[PDB]
Tab-separated table of C-alpha atoms in Angstrom:
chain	number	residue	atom	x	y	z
A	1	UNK	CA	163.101	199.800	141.991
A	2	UNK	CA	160.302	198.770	144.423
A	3	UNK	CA	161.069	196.480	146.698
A	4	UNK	CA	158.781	193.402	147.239
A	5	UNK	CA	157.031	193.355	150.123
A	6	UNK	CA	153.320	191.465	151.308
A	7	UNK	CA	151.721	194.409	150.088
A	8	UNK	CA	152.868	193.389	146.533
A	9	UNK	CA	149.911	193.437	144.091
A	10	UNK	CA	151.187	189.365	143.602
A	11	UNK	CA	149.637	188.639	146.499
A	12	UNK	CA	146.528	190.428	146.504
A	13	UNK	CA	144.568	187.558	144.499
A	14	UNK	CA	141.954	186.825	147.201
A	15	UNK	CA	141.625	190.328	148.954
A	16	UNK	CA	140.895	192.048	145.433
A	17	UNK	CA	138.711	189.266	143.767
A	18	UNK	CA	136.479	188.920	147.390
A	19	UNK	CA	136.400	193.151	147.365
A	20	UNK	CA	134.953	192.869	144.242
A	21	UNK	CA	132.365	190.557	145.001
A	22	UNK	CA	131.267	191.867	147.952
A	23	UNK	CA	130.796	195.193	146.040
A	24	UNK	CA	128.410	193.703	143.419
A	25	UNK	CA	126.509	192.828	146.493
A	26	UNK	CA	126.331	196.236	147.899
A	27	UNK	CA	125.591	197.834	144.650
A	28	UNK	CA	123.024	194.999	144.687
A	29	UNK	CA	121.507	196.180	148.194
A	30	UNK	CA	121.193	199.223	146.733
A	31	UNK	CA	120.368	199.204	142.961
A	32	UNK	CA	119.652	195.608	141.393
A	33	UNK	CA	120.041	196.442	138.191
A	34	UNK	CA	124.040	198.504	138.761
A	35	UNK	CA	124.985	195.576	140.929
A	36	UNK	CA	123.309	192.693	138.772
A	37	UNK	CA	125.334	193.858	135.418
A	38	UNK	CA	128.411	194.481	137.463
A	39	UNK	CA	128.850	190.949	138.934
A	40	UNK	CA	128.152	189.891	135.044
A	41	UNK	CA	130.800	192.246	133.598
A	42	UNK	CA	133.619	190.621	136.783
A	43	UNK	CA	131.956	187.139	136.195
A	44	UNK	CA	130.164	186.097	139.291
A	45	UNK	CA	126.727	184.854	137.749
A	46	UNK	CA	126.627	184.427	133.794
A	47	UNK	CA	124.483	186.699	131.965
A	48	UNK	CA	121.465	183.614	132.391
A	49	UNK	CA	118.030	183.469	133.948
A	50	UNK	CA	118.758	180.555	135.927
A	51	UNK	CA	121.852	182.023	136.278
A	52	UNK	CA	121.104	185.187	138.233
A	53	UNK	CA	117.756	183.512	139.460
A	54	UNK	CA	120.561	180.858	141.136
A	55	UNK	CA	122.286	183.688	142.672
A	56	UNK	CA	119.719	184.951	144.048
A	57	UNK	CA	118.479	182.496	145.775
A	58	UNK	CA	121.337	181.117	147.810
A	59	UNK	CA	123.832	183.919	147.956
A	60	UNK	CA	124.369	185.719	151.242
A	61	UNK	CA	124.694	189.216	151.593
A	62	UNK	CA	121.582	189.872	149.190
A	63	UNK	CA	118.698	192.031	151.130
A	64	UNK	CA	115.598	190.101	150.117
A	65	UNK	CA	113.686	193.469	150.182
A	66	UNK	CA	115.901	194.308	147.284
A	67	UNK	CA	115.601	190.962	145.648
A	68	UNK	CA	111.950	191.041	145.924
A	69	UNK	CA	112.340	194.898	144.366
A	70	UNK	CA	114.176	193.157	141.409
A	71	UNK	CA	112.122	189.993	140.838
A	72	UNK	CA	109.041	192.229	141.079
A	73	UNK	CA	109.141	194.577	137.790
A	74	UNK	CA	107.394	194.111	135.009
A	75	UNK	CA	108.958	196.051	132.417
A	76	UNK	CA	112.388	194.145	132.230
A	77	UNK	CA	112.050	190.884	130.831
A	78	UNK	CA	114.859	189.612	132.083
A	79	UNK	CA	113.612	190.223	135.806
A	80	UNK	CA	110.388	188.162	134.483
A	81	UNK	CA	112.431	185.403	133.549
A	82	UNK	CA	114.791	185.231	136.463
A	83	UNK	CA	111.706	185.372	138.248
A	84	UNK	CA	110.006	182.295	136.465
A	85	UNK	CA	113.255	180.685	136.804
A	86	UNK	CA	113.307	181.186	140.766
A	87	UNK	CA	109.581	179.618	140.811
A	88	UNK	CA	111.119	177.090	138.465
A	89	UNK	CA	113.165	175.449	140.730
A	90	UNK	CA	110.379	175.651	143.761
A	91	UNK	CA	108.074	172.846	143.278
A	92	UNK	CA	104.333	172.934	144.817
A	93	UNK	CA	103.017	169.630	144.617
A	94	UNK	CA	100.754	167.971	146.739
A	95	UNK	CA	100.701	171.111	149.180
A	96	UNK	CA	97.755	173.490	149.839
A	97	UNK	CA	97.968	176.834	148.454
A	98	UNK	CA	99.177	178.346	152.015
A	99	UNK	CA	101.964	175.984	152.346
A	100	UNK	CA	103.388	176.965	149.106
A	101	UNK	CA	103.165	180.468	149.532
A	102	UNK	CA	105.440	179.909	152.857
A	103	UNK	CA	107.628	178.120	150.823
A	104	UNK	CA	107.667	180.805	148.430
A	105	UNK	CA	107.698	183.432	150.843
A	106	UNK	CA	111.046	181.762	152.801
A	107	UNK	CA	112.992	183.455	149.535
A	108	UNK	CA	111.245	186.666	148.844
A	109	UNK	CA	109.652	189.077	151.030
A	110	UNK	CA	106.587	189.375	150.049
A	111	UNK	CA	105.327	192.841	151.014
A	112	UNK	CA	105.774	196.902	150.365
A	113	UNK	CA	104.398	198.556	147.148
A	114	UNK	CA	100.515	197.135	145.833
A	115	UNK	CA	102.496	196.846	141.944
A	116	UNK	CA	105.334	194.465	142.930
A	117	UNK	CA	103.548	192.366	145.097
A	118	UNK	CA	100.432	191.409	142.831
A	119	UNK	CA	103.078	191.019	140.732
A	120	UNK	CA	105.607	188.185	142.584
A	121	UNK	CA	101.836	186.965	143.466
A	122	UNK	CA	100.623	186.357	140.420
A	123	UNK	CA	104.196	184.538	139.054
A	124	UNK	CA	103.887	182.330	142.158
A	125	UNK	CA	99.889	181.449	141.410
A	126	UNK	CA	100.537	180.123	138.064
A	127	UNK	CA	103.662	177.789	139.418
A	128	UNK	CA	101.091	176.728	141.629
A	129	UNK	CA	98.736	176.071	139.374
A	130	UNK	CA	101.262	174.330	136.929
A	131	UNK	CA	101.982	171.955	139.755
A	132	UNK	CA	98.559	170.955	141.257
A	133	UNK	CA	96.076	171.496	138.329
A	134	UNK	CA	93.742	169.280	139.911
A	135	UNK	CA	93.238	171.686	142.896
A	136	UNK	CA	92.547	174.732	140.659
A	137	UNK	CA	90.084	172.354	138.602
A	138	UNK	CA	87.544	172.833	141.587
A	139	UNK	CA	87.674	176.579	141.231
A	140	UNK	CA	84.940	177.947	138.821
A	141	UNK	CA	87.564	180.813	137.611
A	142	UNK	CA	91.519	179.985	138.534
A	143	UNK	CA	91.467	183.700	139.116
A	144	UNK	CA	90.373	182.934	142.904
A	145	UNK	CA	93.750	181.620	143.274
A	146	UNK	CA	95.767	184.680	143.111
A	147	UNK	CA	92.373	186.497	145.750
A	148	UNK	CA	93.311	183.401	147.903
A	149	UNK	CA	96.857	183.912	148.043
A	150	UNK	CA	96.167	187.797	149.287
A	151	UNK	CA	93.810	186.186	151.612
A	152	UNK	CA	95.990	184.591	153.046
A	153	UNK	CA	98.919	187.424	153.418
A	154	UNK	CA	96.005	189.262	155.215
A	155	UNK	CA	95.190	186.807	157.476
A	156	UNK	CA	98.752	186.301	158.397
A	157	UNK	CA	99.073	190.435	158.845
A	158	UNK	CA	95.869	190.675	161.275
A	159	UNK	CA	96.965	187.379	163.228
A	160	UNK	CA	100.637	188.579	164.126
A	161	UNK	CA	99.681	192.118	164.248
A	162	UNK	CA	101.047	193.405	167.149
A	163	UNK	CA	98.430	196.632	166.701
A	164	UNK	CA	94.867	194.910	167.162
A	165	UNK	CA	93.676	193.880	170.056
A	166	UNK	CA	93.510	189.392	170.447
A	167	UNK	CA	89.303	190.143	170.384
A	168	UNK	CA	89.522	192.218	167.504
A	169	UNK	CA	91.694	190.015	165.449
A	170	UNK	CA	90.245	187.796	162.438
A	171	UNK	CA	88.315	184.591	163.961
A	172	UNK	CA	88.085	181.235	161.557
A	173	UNK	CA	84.638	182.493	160.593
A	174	UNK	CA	85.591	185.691	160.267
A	175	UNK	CA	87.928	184.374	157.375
A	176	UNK	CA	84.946	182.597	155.878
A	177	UNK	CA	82.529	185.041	155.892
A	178	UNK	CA	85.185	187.521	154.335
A	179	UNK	CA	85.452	185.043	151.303
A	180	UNK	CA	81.495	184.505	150.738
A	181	UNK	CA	81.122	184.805	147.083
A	182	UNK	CA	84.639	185.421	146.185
A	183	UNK	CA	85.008	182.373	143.457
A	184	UNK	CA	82.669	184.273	141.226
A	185	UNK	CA	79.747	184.442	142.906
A	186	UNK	CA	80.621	180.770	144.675
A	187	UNK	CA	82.604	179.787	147.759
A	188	UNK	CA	85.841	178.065	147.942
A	189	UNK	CA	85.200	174.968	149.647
A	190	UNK	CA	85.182	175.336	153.958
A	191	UNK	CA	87.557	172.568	154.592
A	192	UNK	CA	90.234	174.085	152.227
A	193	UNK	CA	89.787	177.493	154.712
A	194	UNK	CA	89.898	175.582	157.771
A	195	UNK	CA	93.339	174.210	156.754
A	196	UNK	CA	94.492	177.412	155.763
A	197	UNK	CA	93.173	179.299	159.236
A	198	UNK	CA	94.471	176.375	161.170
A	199	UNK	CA	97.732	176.562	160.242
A	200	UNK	CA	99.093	179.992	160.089
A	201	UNK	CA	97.662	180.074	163.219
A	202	UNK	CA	100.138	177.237	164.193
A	203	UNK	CA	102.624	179.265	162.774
A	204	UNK	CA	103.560	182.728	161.117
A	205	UNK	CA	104.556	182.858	157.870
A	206	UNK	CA	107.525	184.534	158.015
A	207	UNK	CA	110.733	185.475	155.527
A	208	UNK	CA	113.845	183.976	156.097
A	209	UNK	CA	116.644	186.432	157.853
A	210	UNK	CA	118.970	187.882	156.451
A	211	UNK	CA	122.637	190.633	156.893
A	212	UNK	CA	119.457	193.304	157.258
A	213	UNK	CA	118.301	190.956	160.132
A	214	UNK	CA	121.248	190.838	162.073
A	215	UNK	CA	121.962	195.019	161.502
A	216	UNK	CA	118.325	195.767	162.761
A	217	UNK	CA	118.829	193.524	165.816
A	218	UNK	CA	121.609	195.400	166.624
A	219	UNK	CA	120.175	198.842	166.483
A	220	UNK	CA	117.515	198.045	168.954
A	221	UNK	CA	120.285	197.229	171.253
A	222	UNK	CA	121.376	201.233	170.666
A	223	UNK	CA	119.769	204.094	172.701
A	224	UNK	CA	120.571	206.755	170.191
A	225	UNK	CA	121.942	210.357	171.638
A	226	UNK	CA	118.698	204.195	162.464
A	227	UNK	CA	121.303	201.608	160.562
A	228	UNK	CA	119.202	198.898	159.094
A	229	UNK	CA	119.255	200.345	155.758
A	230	UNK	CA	119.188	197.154	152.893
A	231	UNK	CA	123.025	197.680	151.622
A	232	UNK	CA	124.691	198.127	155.398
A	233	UNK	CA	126.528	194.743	157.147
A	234	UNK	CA	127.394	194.251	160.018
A	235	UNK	CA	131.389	193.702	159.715
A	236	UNK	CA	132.796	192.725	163.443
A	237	UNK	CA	131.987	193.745	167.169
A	238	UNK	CA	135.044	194.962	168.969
A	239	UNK	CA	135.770	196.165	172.485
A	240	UNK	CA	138.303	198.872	172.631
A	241	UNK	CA	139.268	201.643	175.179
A	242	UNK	CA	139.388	205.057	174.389
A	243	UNK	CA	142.307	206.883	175.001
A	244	UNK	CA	142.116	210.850	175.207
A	245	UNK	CA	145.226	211.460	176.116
A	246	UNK	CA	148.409	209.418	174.832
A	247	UNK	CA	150.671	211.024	176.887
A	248	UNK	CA	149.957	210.202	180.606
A	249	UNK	CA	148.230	206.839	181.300
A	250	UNK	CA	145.084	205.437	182.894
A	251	UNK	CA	143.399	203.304	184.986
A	252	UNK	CA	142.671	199.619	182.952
A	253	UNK	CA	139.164	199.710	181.852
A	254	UNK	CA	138.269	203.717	181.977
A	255	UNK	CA	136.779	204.846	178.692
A	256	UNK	CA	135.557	201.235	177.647
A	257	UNK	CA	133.723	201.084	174.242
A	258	UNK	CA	131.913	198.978	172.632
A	259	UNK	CA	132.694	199.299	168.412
A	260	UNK	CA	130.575	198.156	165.422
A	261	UNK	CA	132.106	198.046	162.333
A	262	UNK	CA	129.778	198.659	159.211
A	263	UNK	CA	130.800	197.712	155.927
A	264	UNK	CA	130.447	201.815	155.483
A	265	UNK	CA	130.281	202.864	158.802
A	266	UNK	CA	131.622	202.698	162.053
A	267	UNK	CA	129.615	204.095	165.338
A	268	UNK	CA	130.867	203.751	169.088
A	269	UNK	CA	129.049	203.193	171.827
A	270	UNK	CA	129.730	202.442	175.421
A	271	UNK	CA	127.522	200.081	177.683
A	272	UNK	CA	124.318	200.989	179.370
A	273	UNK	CA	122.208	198.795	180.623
A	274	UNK	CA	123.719	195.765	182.127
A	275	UNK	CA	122.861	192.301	183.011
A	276	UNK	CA	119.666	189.804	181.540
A	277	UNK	CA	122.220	188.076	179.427
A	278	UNK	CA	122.861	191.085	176.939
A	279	UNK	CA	123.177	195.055	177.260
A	280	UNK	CA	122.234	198.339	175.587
A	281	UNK	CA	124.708	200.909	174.342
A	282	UNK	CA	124.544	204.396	174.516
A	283	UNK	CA	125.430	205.974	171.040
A	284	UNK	CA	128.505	208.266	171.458
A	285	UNK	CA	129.421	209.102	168.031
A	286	UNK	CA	129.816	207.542	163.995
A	287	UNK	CA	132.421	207.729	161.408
A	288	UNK	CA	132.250	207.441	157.996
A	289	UNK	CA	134.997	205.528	156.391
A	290	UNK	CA	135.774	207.820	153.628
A	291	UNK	CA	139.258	209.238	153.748
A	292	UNK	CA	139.964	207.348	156.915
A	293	UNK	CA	142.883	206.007	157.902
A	294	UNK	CA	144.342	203.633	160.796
A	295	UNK	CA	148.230	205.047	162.214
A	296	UNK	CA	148.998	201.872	164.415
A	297	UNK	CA	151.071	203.576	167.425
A	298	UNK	CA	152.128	202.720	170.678
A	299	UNK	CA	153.898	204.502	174.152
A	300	UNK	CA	154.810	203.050	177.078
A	301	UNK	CA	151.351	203.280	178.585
A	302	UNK	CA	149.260	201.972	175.650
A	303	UNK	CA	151.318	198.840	174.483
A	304	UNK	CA	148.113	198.111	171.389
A	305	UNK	CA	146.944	201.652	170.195
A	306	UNK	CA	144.934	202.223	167.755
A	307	UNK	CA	144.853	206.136	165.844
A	308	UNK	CA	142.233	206.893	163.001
A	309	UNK	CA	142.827	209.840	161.153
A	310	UNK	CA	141.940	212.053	157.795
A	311	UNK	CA	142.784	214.457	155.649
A	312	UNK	CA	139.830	215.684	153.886
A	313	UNK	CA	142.779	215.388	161.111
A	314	UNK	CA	142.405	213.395	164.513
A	315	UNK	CA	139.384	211.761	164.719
A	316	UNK	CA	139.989	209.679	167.951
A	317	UNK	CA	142.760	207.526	170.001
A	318	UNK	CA	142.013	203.930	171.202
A	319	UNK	CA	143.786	201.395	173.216
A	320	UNK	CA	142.879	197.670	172.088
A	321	UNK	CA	142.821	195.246	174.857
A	322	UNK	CA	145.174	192.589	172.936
A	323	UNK	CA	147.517	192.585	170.186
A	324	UNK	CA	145.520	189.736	168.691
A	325	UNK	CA	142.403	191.866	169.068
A	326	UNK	CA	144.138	194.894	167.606
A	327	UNK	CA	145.468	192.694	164.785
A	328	UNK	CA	141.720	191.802	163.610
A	329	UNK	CA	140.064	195.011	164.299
A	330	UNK	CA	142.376	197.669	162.187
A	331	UNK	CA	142.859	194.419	159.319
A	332	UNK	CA	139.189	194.563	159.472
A	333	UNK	CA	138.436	198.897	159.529
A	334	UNK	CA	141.173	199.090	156.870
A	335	UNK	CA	139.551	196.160	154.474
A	336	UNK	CA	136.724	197.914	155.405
A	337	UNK	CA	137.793	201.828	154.583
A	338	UNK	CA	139.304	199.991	151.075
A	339	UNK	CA	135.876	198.811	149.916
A	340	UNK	CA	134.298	202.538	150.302
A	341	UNK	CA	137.138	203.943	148.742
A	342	UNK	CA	137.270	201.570	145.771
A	343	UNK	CA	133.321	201.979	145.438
A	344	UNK	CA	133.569	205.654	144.632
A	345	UNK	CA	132.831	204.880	141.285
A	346	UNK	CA	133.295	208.008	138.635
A	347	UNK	CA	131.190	206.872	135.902
């Protein structure tokens, strides 16, 4: 009795499987163990160390905060294992103990609570002491090598620190006094510490970016009338006009706004500051995308309107500037509104 149409479920392959993936992600971003069993139980990592320690390491969309939340408990096993599996396939060879901890530190962020950090510390000593035994030989107790490795998270800290004064920061002896008698009683050899101060001093060790990156670079572009939490994306950037009243017309460019689209949230802003090759917005209002819809509409004064709605009932009018514009926006808000809805999980 139902007609076929392209909103058939036989043609909703790709949009449901990619929903579905993209909400292991977010349950990910904001509980690693719900999302980690969920992408198991749809079959987007096998239920493997490697397996998940693969995922985590190349995947997009993963907030490395959270990863470093998961790979850093001690109770599962699993998490142990995923985590000597991600040092697995990170090989420190021939590289100083500060040059390995960069590498290491590219993946997983490296800071927060004292118990998760001693913790991805201590997993990443051992894989470098696995890989250059030689250099730990010269160490009285191989326990200096984990005290290094904080050492040198320290240094970094006080070097970049944008809250201590250039005089007051940590000078190259400074470092080496610090460390007097820290191998036990003996000192780790001056030349290894001169390395080590001369080069994070060339450059910062610093995490790689990630969908948190691009959300908290956004939100310092926003003079508020706080987005950048680990499971929120940044979706598209839209220009629209606001319209707010359908029935007579306006002059073109009156009420322009400037829209971000969250994966959960959508905020509008209009421009504030204006030229140096980028802008501010002021924050006008937010919607949540529960129980939102999109009523596509047009008169003859707004040939591309846009109308979002609820019944939980008009939340506000807008006038795209295109119908190729309008196209990708509301395909985008209504993909978008479908994930939150489908996420409203009753278990």
């Amino acid at each position: 009795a139902i007609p076929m149409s392209w909103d058939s479920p036989a043609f909703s392959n790709d949009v449901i499987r990619k929903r579905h993936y993209r909400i292991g992600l977010n349950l990910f971003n904001k509980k690693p163990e719900k999302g980690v069993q969920y992408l198991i139980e749809r079959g987007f990592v096998p239920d493997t160390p490697v397996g998940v320690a693969h995922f985590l390491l190349q995947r997009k969309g993963l907030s490395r905060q959270m990863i470093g939340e998961f790979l850093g408990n001690r109770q599962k096993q699993f998490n142990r294992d995923v985590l000597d599996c991600v040092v697995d396939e990170m090989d420190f060879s021939t590289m100083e103990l500060d040059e390995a901890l960069r590498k290491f530190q590219a993946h997983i962020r490296v800071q927060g609570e004292a118990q998760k950090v001693e913790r991805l510390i201590e997993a990443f000593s051992q894989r470098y002491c696995i890989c250059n035994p030689g250099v730990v030989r010269q160490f009285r107790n191989p326990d200096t090598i984990f005290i290094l490795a904080f050492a040198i998270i320290l240094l970094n800290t006080d070097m970049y620190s944008p809250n201590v004064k250039p005089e007051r920061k940590m000078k190259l002896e400074d470092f080496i006094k610090n460390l007097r008698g820290v191998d036990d009683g003996e000192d780790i050899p001056r030349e290894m510490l001169m390395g080590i101060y001369e080069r994070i001093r060339k450059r910062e060790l610093k995490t790689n970016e990630d969908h948190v990156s691009q959300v908290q670079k956004v939100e310092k572009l926003i003079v508020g009338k706080v987005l950048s939490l680990p499971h929120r994306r940044l979706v598209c950037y839209c220009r629209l006009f606001e319209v707010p009243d359908p029935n007579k017309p306006q002059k073109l460019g009156l009420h322009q706004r400037e829209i971000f689209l969250f994966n959960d949230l959508l905020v509008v802003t209009k421009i504030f500051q204006k030229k140096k090759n980028s802008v501010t917005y002021s924050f006008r209002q937010s919607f949540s995308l529960y129980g939102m819809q999109v009523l596509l509409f047009e008169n003859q004064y707004y040939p591309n309107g846009i109308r979002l709605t609820s019944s939980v009932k008009v939340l506000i009018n807008f006038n795209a500037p295109n119908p190729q514009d309008r196209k990708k926006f509301t395909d985008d808000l209504r993909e978008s509104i479908a994930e939150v809805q489908e996420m409203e999980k009753h278990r």
